[PDB]
Write a protein that binds this DNA or RNA. Structure first.
Length: 48
DNA sequence: ATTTAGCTGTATAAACATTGTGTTATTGGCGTTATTAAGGTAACTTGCTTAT
């Protein structure tokens, strides 16, 4: 629950990063999904 | 009758045939080098484009 609460606020980060690559042969939706997959794994490792 | 010409006989000769023997060659195998995939990395940029 704590991880989900942290992730939902950071959902827009993938869209913001996805803007730079929009015509690399991959559509925006799949790029956003890849960004979300990267963000979820990254959040658990980081320590305060 | 006699032999003569006819007939190829089968040994022999020759050729083949069989056996043996060499050779080699390739599969297998092993290891080998080319290759390759994934993990990991953390200032900051946290609702898009994309279009007659």
């Amino acid at each position: 629950q704590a991880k989900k609460e942290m992730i939902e606020a950071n959902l827009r980060l993938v869209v913001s990063e996805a803007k730079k690559y929009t015509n690399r042969g991959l559509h925006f939706l799949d790029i956003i999904q890849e960004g979300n997959i990267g963000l979820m794994k990254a959040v658990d490792k980081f320590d305060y």
